Coordinates of C-alpha atoms and ligand atoms in Angstrom, one line a residue:
Chain A
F1 CA 50.5 -22.4 7.1
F2 CA 52.2 -19.0 8.6
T3 CA 50.5 -16.6 11.1
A4 CA 50.6 -12.9 10.7
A5 CA 50.8 -10.7 13.9
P6 CA 48.8 -10.3 16.3
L7 CA 48.3 -14.0 15.7
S8 CA 51.0 -16.2 17.1
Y9 CA 51.6 -19.9 17.0
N10 CA 53.8 -21.7 19.5
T11 CA 55.5 -24.8 18.1
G12 CA 56.0 -25.9 21.7
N13 CA 52.4 -27.1 21.7
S14 CA 50.7 -26.4 18.2
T15 CA 48.3 -23.7 19.5
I16 CA 47.6 -20.5 17.7
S17 CA 47.3 -17.2 20.0
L18 CA 46.2 -13.7 19.4
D19 CA 48.8 -11.2 21.3
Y20 CA 47.4 -8.4 22.8
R21 CA 48.5 -5.4 24.8
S22 CA 46.6 -6.6 28.2
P23 CA 46.2 -3.0 29.6
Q24 CA 44.1 -2.1 26.6
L25 CA 42.5 -5.6 25.6
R26 CA 41.2 -8.4 27.5
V27 CA 39.3 -11.6 27.4
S28 CA 36.4 -12.0 29.0
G29 CA 34.2 -15.5 28.9
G30 CA 36.3 -16.7 26.3
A31 CA 35.9 -13.5 24.2
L32 CA 38.0 -10.5 23.2
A33 CA 37.0 -7.3 25.0
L34 CA 38.2 -3.8 25.9
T35 CA 39.9 -3.0 29.6
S36 CA 38.3 0.6 29.2
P37 CA 35.4 0.5 26.6
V38 CA 33.6 3.8 26.3
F39 CA 30.0 3.5 27.0
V40 CA 27.5 6.2 26.8
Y41 CA 23.9 6.0 28.4
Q42 CA 22.2 8.8 26.7
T43 CA 18.6 10.2 25.4
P44 CA 18.1 9.2 22.2
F45 CA 18.5 11.1 18.8
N46 CA 15.6 13.7 18.6
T47 CA 13.9 12.3 21.5
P48 CA 14.8 14.5 24.5
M49 CA 13.3 13.7 28.3
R50 CA 10.0 15.7 29.4
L51 CA 11.3 16.9 32.7
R52 CA 8.6 18.2 35.5
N53 CA 10.0 20.8 38.5
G54 CA 8.8 18.7 41.2
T55 CA 5.0 19.4 41.9
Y56 CA 4.8 22.4 39.7
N57 CA 3.2 22.6 36.0
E58 CA 6.7 23.8 35.1
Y59 CA 8.1 21.3 32.5
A60 CA 11.3 21.1 30.2
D61 CA 13.3 19.0 27.5
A62 CA 16.5 17.6 28.5
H63 CA 18.8 16.0 26.3
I64 CA 21.3 13.9 28.5
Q65 CA 24.7 12.0 28.4
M66 CA 26.5 9.5 30.8
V67 CA 29.7 8.6 29.6
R68 CA 31.9 6.1 31.0
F69 CA 35.5 6.5 30.6
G70 CA 37.6 3.9 32.9
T71 CA 35.7 3.7 35.8
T72 CA 34.7 7.6 35.8
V73 CA 31.4 8.7 34.3
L74 CA 31.0 11.9 32.8
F75 CA 27.5 13.6 33.0
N76 CA 26.2 16.3 30.5
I77 CA 22.9 17.9 30.5
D78 CA 21.1 20.3 28.2
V79 CA 17.8 21.6 30.1
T80 CA 15.5 24.0 27.9
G81 CA 12.5 25.1 30.2
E82 CA 9.6 26.4 28.7
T83 CA 8.5 29.0 31.6
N84 CA 10.0 32.0 32.3
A85 CA 10.9 31.4 36.6
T86 CA 12.4 33.6 39.4
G87 CA 13.3 31.0 41.9
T88 CA 15.1 27.3 42.2
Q89 CA 13.8 24.3 40.1
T90 CA 14.7 20.8 40.8
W91 CA 15.2 18.6 37.9
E92 CA 15.5 15.0 39.3
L93 CA 16.5 11.8 37.4
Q94 CA 16.1 8.4 39.0
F95 CA 17.6 5.1 38.1
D96 CA 17.2 1.4 39.3
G97 CA 20.0 0.9 42.0
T98 CA 20.5 -2.5 40.8
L99 CA 20.2 -2.3 36.8
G100 CA 21.0 1.4 36.3
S101 CA 17.6 1.6 33.7
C102 CA 16.4 5.3 33.9
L103 CA 13.1 5.4 35.6
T104 CA 12.8 9.2 34.9
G105 CA 12.5 8.6 31.1
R106 CA 13.8 6.8 27.8
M107 CA 17.5 6.5 27.5
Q108 CA 19.6 4.0 25.9
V109 CA 23.0 2.8 25.9
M110 CA 24.3 3.8 22.6
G111 CA 27.7 3.0 20.2
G112 CA 29.7 5.4 18.4
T113 CA 28.1 3.5 15.4
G114 CA 24.4 5.2 15.7
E115 CA 23.2 2.0 17.2
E116 CA 21.3 1.0 20.6
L117 CA 23.3 -1.7 22.1
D118 CA 21.9 -4.3 24.3
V119 CA 23.8 -3.6 27.2
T120 CA 22.2 -3.4 31.1
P121 CA 23.3 0.4 32.3
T122 CA 24.6 -0.7 35.7
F123 CA 27.8 1.2 34.8
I124 CA 26.1 4.4 35.4
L125 CA 26.1 3.3 39.2
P126 CA 28.1 4.6 42.1
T127 CA 28.3 2.0 44.5
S128 CA 27.3 -1.7 44.6
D129 CA 26.6 -1.1 48.2
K130 CA 24.0 1.9 47.4
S131 CA 25.5 4.4 49.4
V132 CA 26.9 7.9 48.1
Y133 CA 27.6 11.4 49.1
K134 CA 28.6 13.4 46.2
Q135 CA 27.1 17.2 46.0
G136 CA 28.4 20.5 44.5
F137 CA 27.6 23.4 42.1
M138 CA 28.7 24.3 38.6
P139 CA 28.4 28.1 37.0
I140 CA 26.0 28.1 34.4
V141 CA 24.8 31.0 31.8
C142 CA 21.3 30.6 30.9
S143 CA 19.9 32.2 27.4
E144 CA 17.6 32.4 24.6
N145 CA 17.4 32.4 21.0
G146 CA 21.5 33.8 21.2
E147 CA 20.8 36.3 23.7
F148 CA 22.4 36.5 27.1
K149 CA 20.2 36.6 30.2
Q150 CA 21.8 35.3 33.4
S151 CA 24.9 34.2 34.9
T152 CA 23.8 31.5 37.4
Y153 CA 24.5 28.1 38.9
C154 CA 22.9 24.8 39.1
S155 CA 23.7 22.4 42.0
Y156 CA 23.9 18.6 41.0
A157 CA 23.5 15.8 44.2
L158 CA 24.1 11.9 43.9
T159 CA 21.8 10.2 46.9
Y160 CA 20.3 6.9 47.0
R161 CA 17.0 6.0 48.7
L162 CA 14.8 3.1 48.2
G163 CA 17.3 1.5 46.7
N164 CA 17.6 3.2 43.6
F165 CA 20.1 6.1 42.3
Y166 CA 19.0 9.9 42.2
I167 CA 20.6 12.8 40.3
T168 CA 19.2 15.8 41.8
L169 CA 19.5 19.1 39.9
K170 CA 18.9 23.0 40.8
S171 CA 18.9 25.6 38.9
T172 CA 18.5 28.8 40.5
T173 CA 16.8 31.9 37.9
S174 CA 15.9 35.3 37.8
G175 CA 13.3 36.6 35.5
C176 CA 14.5 33.9 32.7
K177 CA 14.0 30.7 31.3
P178 CA 16.4 27.9 32.5
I179 CA 17.9 27.1 29.5
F180 CA 21.7 25.7 29.8
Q181 CA 24.0 23.3 29.6
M182 CA 26.2 21.6 32.9
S183 CA 28.6 18.9 33.2
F184 CA 30.3 17.4 36.1
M185 CA 32.3 13.9 36.8
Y186 CA 31.7 11.0 39.6
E187 CA 33.0 8.0 39.9
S188 CA 31.7 4.1 39.9
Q189 CA 33.7 1.4 41.4
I190 CA 30.8 -1.1 39.3
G191 CA 33.4 -2.8 36.9
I192 CA 32.6 -3.6 33.3
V193 CA 33.7 -6.8 33.3
Chain B
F1 CA 46.7 -27.7 15.4
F2 CA 44.9 -25.8 18.3
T3 CA 43.2 -22.6 19.4
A4 CA 43.8 -20.6 22.8
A5 CA 41.3 -17.8 23.4
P6 CA 39.8 -15.7 22.2
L7 CA 40.3 -17.7 19.1
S8 CA 38.1 -20.7 18.5
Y9 CA 38.6 -23.6 16.0
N10 CA 34.7 -25.3 15.3
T11 CA 35.9 -29.0 14.1
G12 CA 31.7 -29.0 12.8
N13 CA 32.5 -26.6 10.1
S14 CA 36.1 -26.6 10.1
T15 CA 36.2 -22.6 10.7
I16 CA 38.5 -20.7 12.9
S17 CA 36.9 -17.5 14.3
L18 CA 37.8 -14.1 16.6
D19 CA 35.0 -14.0 19.4
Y20 CA 34.5 -10.8 20.7
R21 CA 32.1 -9.0 22.7
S22 CA 29.9 -7.4 20.3
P23 CA 29.0 -4.2 22.4
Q24 CA 32.7 -3.6 22.6
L25 CA 33.9 -4.8 19.3
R26 CA 32.4 -5.6 15.4
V27 CA 33.3 -6.0 12.4
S28 CA 33.3 -3.5 9.6
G29 CA 33.7 -4.6 5.8
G30 CA 35.4 -7.9 7.1
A31 CA 37.8 -5.7 9.6
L32 CA 37.9 -5.8 13.5
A33 CA 36.6 -2.5 14.6
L34 CA 35.4 -0.9 17.7
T35 CA 31.7 -0.3 18.7
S36 CA 32.6 3.1 20.4
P37 CA 36.0 4.3 19.2
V38 CA 37.8 7.6 20.7
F39 CA 38.3 10.0 17.8
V40 CA 39.8 13.5 17.9
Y41 CA 40.1 16.1 15.8
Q42 CA 42.4 18.8 16.5
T43 CA 44.7 21.6 15.5
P44 CA 48.1 19.9 15.4
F45 CA 50.6 20.2 18.5
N46 CA 52.0 23.7 19.1
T47 CA 50.2 25.0 15.6
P48 CA 47.6 27.0 17.0
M49 CA 44.7 28.6 14.5
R50 CA 44.7 32.0 13.7
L51 CA 41.4 33.5 14.1
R52 CA 40.1 37.0 12.8
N53 CA 37.3 39.0 14.7
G54 CA 35.0 39.6 12.1
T55 CA 36.1 42.4 10.2
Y56 CA 38.1 44.2 12.8
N57 CA 41.7 44.1 12.9
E58 CA 41.7 41.9 15.8
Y59 CA 43.5 38.0 15.8
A60 CA 43.8 35.4 18.3
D61 CA 46.0 32.1 18.5
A62 CA 43.2 28.8 19.2
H63 CA 44.1 25.3 19.7
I64 CA 41.1 23.3 19.4
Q65 CA 40.3 19.6 20.3
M66 CA 36.9 18.2 19.2
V67 CA 36.7 14.6 21.0
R68 CA 34.1 12.1 19.9
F69 CA 33.0 9.4 21.8
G70 CA 29.9 7.2 21.4
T71 CA 27.7 9.9 19.2
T72 CA 28.8 13.0 21.3
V73 CA 31.3 15.5 20.7
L74 CA 32.8 17.5 23.0
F75 CA 34.4 20.8 21.7
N76 CA 37.3 22.4 23.7
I77 CA 39.1 25.7 23.0
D78 CA 41.6 27.7 24.0
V79 CA 41.6 31.4 22.9
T80 CA 44.8 33.7 23.1
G81 CA 43.4 37.0 22.1
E82 CA 45.9 40.1 21.2
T83 CA 43.6 43.2 21.6
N84 CA 42.1 44.7 24.6
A85 CA 38.8 45.2 23.9
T86 CA 35.1 46.2 25.0
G87 CA 32.1 44.6 23.2
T88 CA 31.9 41.1 21.6
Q89 CA 33.9 39.3 19.4
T90 CA 33.0 36.9 16.8
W91 CA 35.0 33.8 16.4
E92 CA 33.8 31.6 13.4
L93 CA 35.1 28.1 12.4
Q94 CA 33.8 26.6 9.0
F95 CA 33.9 22.9 8.2
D96 CA 33.2 21.1 4.8
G97 CA 29.5 20.2 5.0
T98 CA 30.1 16.6 4.2
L99 CA 33.7 15.6 4.9
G100 CA 34.2 17.8 8.0
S101 CA 37.3 19.4 7.1
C102 CA 38.2 22.5 8.5
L103 CA 38.5 25.3 6.3
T104 CA 39.1 28.1 8.7
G105 CA 42.6 26.4 9.6
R106 CA 44.6 23.2 9.9
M107 CA 43.2 20.7 11.9
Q108 CA 44.3 16.7 11.7
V109 CA 42.7 13.6 13.2
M110 CA 45.1 12.7 15.9
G111 CA 45.3 8.9 17.3
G112 CA 46.7 8.3 21.0
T113 CA 50.1 7.2 19.5
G114 CA 50.7 11.0 18.7
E115 CA 50.3 10.1 14.8
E116 CA 47.7 11.7 12.4
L117 CA 45.2 9.2 11.2
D118 CA 43.8 9.2 7.4
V119 CA 40.5 9.4 8.6
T120 CA 37.9 12.2 6.7
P121 CA 36.5 13.9 10.0
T122 CA 33.1 13.7 9.3
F123 CA 32.5 12.4 12.8
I124 CA 32.2 16.1 14.0
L125 CA 29.5 17.1 11.4
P126 CA 26.1 17.4 13.6
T127 CA 23.9 15.7 10.5
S128 CA 24.4 14.6 7.1
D129 CA 20.9 16.0 5.4
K130 CA 19.0 17.8 8.2
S131 CA 19.5 21.6 8.3
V132 CA 20.6 22.2 12.3
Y133 CA 20.5 25.4 14.2
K134 CA 21.8 25.4 18.3
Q135 CA 22.8 27.7 20.2
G136 CA 24.0 28.2 24.3
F137 CA 26.7 30.0 26.3
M138 CA 29.1 29.3 29.0
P139 CA 30.6 31.0 31.3
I140 CA 34.5 31.8 30.9
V141 CA 36.8 33.6 32.8
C142 CA 39.2 36.0 31.1
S143 CA 42.9 36.1 32.2
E144 CA 46.5 37.3 31.1
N145 CA 49.8 36.1 32.2
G146 CA 48.0 34.6 35.3
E147 CA 46.3 37.4 36.3
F148 CA 42.4 37.4 36.9
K149 CA 40.8 39.9 34.6
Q150 CA 37.2 39.3 34.2
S151 CA 34.1 36.7 34.8
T152 CA 32.2 36.9 31.8
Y153 CA 30.6 34.3 29.2
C154 CA 30.9 33.1 25.7
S155 CA 28.0 31.7 23.2
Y156 CA 28.6 29.0 20.8
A157 CA 26.4 28.4 17.7
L158 CA 25.7 25.4 15.4
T159 CA 24.7 26.4 11.9
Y160 CA 24.1 24.0 9.1
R161 CA 21.2 24.0 5.5
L162 CA 23.5 21.5 3.7
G163 CA 26.3 24.1 3.0
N164 CA 29.3 24.5 5.1
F165 CA 28.8 23.3 9.0
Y166 CA 29.6 26.4 11.1
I167 CA 30.8 26.8 14.7
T168 CA 30.3 30.3 15.8
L169 CA 31.9 31.6 19.4
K170 CA 30.8 35.2 20.5
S171 CA 33.1 36.6 23.6
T172 CA 31.7 39.5 25.5
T173 CA 35.2 41.5 27.2
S174 CA 35.3 44.8 29.0
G175 CA 38.5 46.2 28.8
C176 CA 40.7 43.2 28.5
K177 CA 41.8 40.9 26.1
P178 CA 39.9 37.7 25.2
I179 CA 41.7 35.1 26.7
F180 CA 40.1 32.2 27.7
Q181 CA 39.3 28.1 27.6
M182 CA 36.0 27.1 27.3
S183 CA 34.2 23.6 26.2
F184 CA 30.8 22.2 25.3
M185 CA 29.0 19.2 24.3
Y186 CA 27.0 18.5 21.3
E187 CA 25.5 15.3 19.5
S188 CA 26.3 14.2 16.0
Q189 CA 24.1 12.0 14.0
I190 CA 27.2 10.6 11.9
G191 CA 27.4 7.1 12.8
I192 CA 31.3 5.8 13.3
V193 CA 31.0 2.6 10.9
Chain C
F1 CA 39.8 -25.2 7.2
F2 CA 37.8 -21.6 6.8
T3 CA 38.5 -18.4 8.2
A4 CA 35.3 -16.6 9.6
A5 CA 36.1 -12.5 9.3
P6 CA 37.7 -10.9 10.6
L7 CA 40.2 -13.5 10.3
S8 CA 41.3 -14.3 6.7
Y9 CA 43.7 -16.3 4.8
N10 CA 45.9 -15.4 2.2
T11 CA 45.9 -18.0 -0.7
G12 CA 49.5 -17.3 -2.1
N13 CA 51.7 -16.6 0.9
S14 CA 49.9 -19.5 3.0
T15 CA 49.5 -16.9 5.8
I16 CA 46.3 -16.2 8.2
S17 CA 45.9 -12.8 9.5
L18 CA 43.4 -10.6 11.8
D19 CA 42.0 -7.8 9.6
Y20 CA 41.3 -4.7 11.6
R21 CA 40.6 -1.0 11.0
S22 CA 43.6 0.9 11.3
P23 CA 42.4 4.2 12.3
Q24 CA 41.0 2.2 15.3
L25 CA 43.3 -0.4 16.1
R26 CA 47.0 -1.3 15.8
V27 CA 49.9 -3.7 16.4
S28 CA 52.9 -2.9 18.7
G29 CA 55.4 -5.1 19.1
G30 CA 53.3 -7.8 17.2
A31 CA 50.6 -7.3 19.8
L32 CA 47.0 -6.2 19.1
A33 CA 46.2 -2.7 20.6
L34 CA 44.3 0.5 20.2
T35 CA 44.8 3.7 18.2
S36 CA 43.4 5.7 20.9
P37 CA 43.1 3.9 24.2
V38 CA 41.5 5.5 27.2
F39 CA 43.8 5.3 30.2
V40 CA 42.7 7.3 33.6
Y41 CA 45.1 8.4 36.6
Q42 CA 43.0 8.8 39.7
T43 CA 43.0 9.4 43.2
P44 CA 41.7 5.8 44.8
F45 CA 38.2 5.5 45.6
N46 CA 36.9 6.6 48.5
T47 CA 40.8 7.5 49.1
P48 CA 41.0 11.6 48.5
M49 CA 44.4 13.4 48.4
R50 CA 45.2 15.9 51.4
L51 CA 46.1 19.0 50.3
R52 CA 47.6 22.1 52.1
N53 CA 47.5 25.8 51.3
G54 CA 50.8 26.6 51.0
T55 CA 52.4 27.2 54.3
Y56 CA 49.3 28.2 55.8
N57 CA 47.1 25.8 58.7
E58 CA 44.5 25.4 55.8
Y59 CA 43.7 21.8 54.3
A60 CA 41.6 20.0 52.1
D61 CA 40.6 16.9 50.4
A62 CA 41.1 16.3 46.7
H63 CA 39.5 13.7 44.5
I64 CA 41.1 13.8 41.1
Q65 CA 41.1 12.4 37.8
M66 CA 43.4 12.7 34.6
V67 CA 41.6 11.3 31.7
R68 CA 43.3 10.5 28.5
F69 CA 42.1 10.3 25.4
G70 CA 43.7 10.5 22.1
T71 CA 46.6 12.9 23.0
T72 CA 44.2 14.7 25.1
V73 CA 44.0 15.1 29.2
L74 CA 40.6 16.1 30.9
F75 CA 41.9 17.2 34.4
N76 CA 39.0 16.9 37.1
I77 CA 39.5 17.7 40.8
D78 CA 36.7 17.9 43.6
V79 CA 38.3 20.6 46.1
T80 CA 36.9 20.2 49.9
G81 CA 38.5 22.6 51.7
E82 CA 38.2 23.0 55.6
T83 CA 38.7 26.6 56.6
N84 CA 36.7 29.6 56.1
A85 CA 39.0 32.0 54.1
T86 CA 39.3 35.5 52.4
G87 CA 41.9 35.2 49.8
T88 CA 43.5 33.3 47.3
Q89 CA 44.5 29.6 48.2
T90 CA 47.4 27.4 46.1
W91 CA 47.1 23.9 45.7
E92 CA 49.7 22.0 44.2
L93 CA 50.2 18.4 43.0
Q94 CA 53.6 17.2 41.9
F95 CA 54.1 14.6 39.6
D96 CA 57.5 12.8 38.7
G97 CA 58.8 14.2 35.3
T98 CA 60.3 10.9 33.8
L99 CA 57.5 8.3 35.0
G100 CA 54.4 10.7 35.8
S101 CA 54.1 9.0 39.1
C102 CA 52.1 11.6 41.9
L103 CA 54.5 12.5 44.4
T104 CA 52.0 14.5 46.3
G105 CA 49.8 11.8 47.4
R106 CA 48.9 8.2 45.8
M107 CA 47.1 8.0 42.6
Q108 CA 46.5 4.5 40.3
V109 CA 46.0 3.8 36.5
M110 CA 42.4 2.3 36.9
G111 CA 41.2 0.1 34.0
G112 CA 36.9 0.3 32.8
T113 CA 37.5 -3.4 35.0
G114 CA 38.0 -1.8 38.5
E115 CA 41.3 -3.1 38.4
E116 CA 44.3 -1.1 38.9
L117 CA 47.0 -1.1 35.7
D118 CA 50.6 -2.1 35.6
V119 CA 51.1 0.8 33.7
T120 CA 53.4 3.8 34.0
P121 CA 51.5 7.3 33.5
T122 CA 53.6 8.8 31.1
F123 CA 50.4 9.1 29.5
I124 CA 49.5 12.7 31.5
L125 CA 53.0 14.5 31.1
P126 CA 52.3 17.6 28.7
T127 CA 55.8 17.8 27.3
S128 CA 58.7 15.7 26.4
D129 CA 61.4 18.0 26.7
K130 CA 60.2 19.5 29.8
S131 CA 59.3 23.2 28.9
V132 CA 55.6 24.1 29.1
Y133 CA 53.5 27.5 30.6
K134 CA 50.0 26.6 29.9
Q135 CA 47.8 28.5 32.3
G136 CA 44.2 30.2 32.6
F137 CA 41.1 30.4 34.5
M138 CA 37.8 28.7 35.2
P139 CA 34.4 29.9 36.7
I140 CA 33.9 28.0 39.8
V141 CA 31.1 27.9 42.6
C142 CA 32.1 27.4 46.2
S143 CA 28.9 25.3 48.1
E144 CA 28.9 23.9 51.4
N145 CA 26.3 21.2 52.3
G146 CA 24.4 21.8 49.4
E147 CA 23.9 25.7 50.0
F148 CA 25.4 27.9 47.7
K149 CA 28.0 30.3 48.9
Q150 CA 29.8 32.2 46.0
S151 CA 30.2 32.4 42.3
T152 CA 34.1 32.3 41.9
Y153 CA 37.3 31.3 40.0
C154 CA 40.3 29.0 40.0
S155 CA 43.5 29.3 38.1
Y156 CA 45.4 26.5 36.9
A157 CA 49.2 26.5 35.5
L158 CA 51.2 23.7 34.1
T159 CA 55.0 24.2 35.0
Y160 CA 58.4 22.2 35.5
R161 CA 60.4 22.8 38.3
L162 CA 63.6 20.8 39.3
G163 CA 62.8 18.4 36.6
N164 CA 59.0 17.5 38.1
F165 CA 55.9 18.5 36.4
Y166 CA 53.6 20.6 38.8
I167 CA 49.5 21.2 38.1
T168 CA 49.1 24.2 40.2
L169 CA 45.7 25.6 41.3
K170 CA 44.9 28.5 42.7
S171 CA 40.9 29.5 43.9
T172 CA 40.1 32.6 45.5
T173 CA 37.3 32.8 48.0
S174 CA 35.6 35.7 50.3
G175 CA 34.0 34.2 53.5
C176 CA 33.4 30.7 52.3
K177 CA 35.1 27.6 52.2
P178 CA 37.3 26.5 49.3
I179 CA 34.7 23.6 48.4
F180 CA 34.4 23.2 44.4
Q181 CA 35.1 21.0 41.1
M182 CA 36.5 22.0 38.2
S183 CA 37.7 20.6 35.2
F184 CA 40.3 21.9 32.1
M185 CA 42.0 20.3 29.2
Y186 CA 45.4 20.1 28.3
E187 CA 47.5 18.5 25.3
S188 CA 50.1 15.7 26.0
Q189 CA 52.9 15.7 23.4
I190 CA 53.8 11.6 25.0
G191 CA 52.3 9.4 22.6
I192 CA 51.0 6.0 23.5
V193 CA 52.7 3.3 21.6
Ligands
NAG1 C1 7.4 31.1 37.1 C2 8.0 31.0 38.3 O1 8.7 31.8 38.9 N1 8.4 29.6 39.0 C3 9.5 29.7 39.8 C4 9.7 28.4 40.1 O2 10.5 27.9 38.8 C5 10.6 28.2 41.2 O3 10.7 26.3 41.7 C6 10.0 27.9 42.5 C7 10.6 28.0 43.9 O4 11.9 28.3 43.9 O5 9.7 29.5 42.5 C8 8.6 29.5 41.4 O6 8.6 31.3 41.4
NAG2 C1 39.2 47.8 20.5 C2 38.1 47.3 20.9 O1 37.4 47.5 22.1 N1 37.0 46.0 20.0 C3 36.1 45.9 20.3 C4 35.7 44.4 19.3 O2 36.4 43.6 20.2 C5 34.0 43.9 19.4 O3 34.3 42.8 18.3 C6 33.1 45.2 18.7 C7 32.0 44.8 18.6 O4 31.4 44.5 19.7 O5 33.5 46.3 19.4 C8 35.0 46.8 19.4 O6 34.9 48.4 19.8
NAG3 C1 41.7 32.4 57.0 C2 41.9 32.8 56.1 O1 41.3 33.8 55.5 N1 43.1 32.5 55.1 C3 44.0 33.1 53.9 C4 44.1 32.1 53.1 O2 43.1 30.9 52.7 C5 44.6 32.4 51.5 O3 45.7 31.5 51.2 C6 45.7 33.5 51.9 C7 46.4 34.4 50.5 O4 45.4 35.0 50.1 O5 45.3 34.9 52.6 C8 44.6 34.6 53.8 O6 43.9 35.4 54.3

């Protein structure tokens, strides 16, 4: 028989092989995998996460995507608060510091096929040694039903406590509902192998 | 003959197979594919789209990239307006509601190779058979020739009711040209299979 | 013997093949590769680059990621300035115009596995023929130790000078340290082949 590329036949030892570009593809436990696969940990379709502003009776819906490109994580959140507010709201997400599972609400690893993947979400975790400093602010615009309300900001802060990973967001509003989209990037040293 | 990993020969049923990591690779109609491929639907290299501000005699050039990963679309637009304006401009993009093809201007599915891909861009559509309306605002900075002009805002709006798919952007300016970059994210329930 | 999908045997030319979806995977030089692979050029984990505000005695630490998907680059920077300032600071990154290698400080092509890849970072270069003038502004928020300081802006400019590729960023502050994260997107006409 013949082998068409990318299959090749080594006459020197009667071996059929798959040739692949190693920076892009790899072998892991005898199976073909990607060097830099895209993995997304997200809230499901039509299932936003319910969040509470600390101890207040102020709630919001949040759609969340955490996207792994190489070793970077792109974090996106879309928040729809139900209370008009003047102050700073704290929207806190907790994740198991070993497995990555979201403790705050329902998230899942989702393929581009639209199907849930049976994958433990360690890939969102910054460090295997459970320490991290990262904080900053992003500019945001709050609106409601297509109407501009306020140009303001939202902080983000990555921490560990009690061995779990926290992403704490804080939005500042003046007489408007916290309804906004914000994203930022961070780095993971957890390898996908 | 022999097989080297990730290929595998089964002497039991005399079958040669490819072993692959299922959360990263898959089979689609007998062919190897990715579980989470990156696709980009964009204006061609150095071929910005012409956009008209409603019925006004006011135009802009636009470079657009719509980057699909997992089930998320990252929309990025580079708008270069030509008329100094005070008011709100409306930039409307229209896409075929079934195929995703841009009707407002020329866009192509572009691989990392730099080659156009022969792919129907259904992966930018938010849904196939569910009416959709989603709006938000992002902060922007208008500039001209490297010089700051105004910190302001642009709304985005996704509309669909089983005709065409619309992305409607509204920039608000005060005595400057609408010249800005802006991105936002949205979900597509169209699986890539 | 039998072949299991995605392997197939053409009874006719006695050839065994790997079937694959061409918009997702491809063959280059007889080797399997991706059509739109993810590559990331970045500062090493916990090894920020040292930058200077032009000739002033004002410095910043910078974490940088340059994410290539399709032909688009997502540039992200986390700038941690050390000196309170009122004015506009200039932060300049310089890259070899042929190979893409960062000349300002150490950066590396990092796979999803957490391993450095042996690849030339040409995939960050905007134009093959060394003529480009992409510039714009992004809104940013300066903070310190998790406290808000200022809503402001930062320009970006992609140029070539003396055969090398420059990304020049200019942050404008009023009585605060230049401490912010910012991102922007641009197009690379260098195909990954
Ligand atoms: C209805 C209302 O104003 N609620 C806000 C609340 O959103 C914020 O978390 C808090 C502390 O800043 O201040 C309250 O006044
Ligand atoms: C020349 C000028 O200012 N044109 C603006 C236009 O850009 C805006 O779309 C419209 C409605 O707000 O108001 C017009 O007057
Ligand atoms: C200490 C201080 O204010 N330094 C700023 C400097 O950051 C800026 O690059 C320069 C040009 O605007 O102006 C100086 O006043």
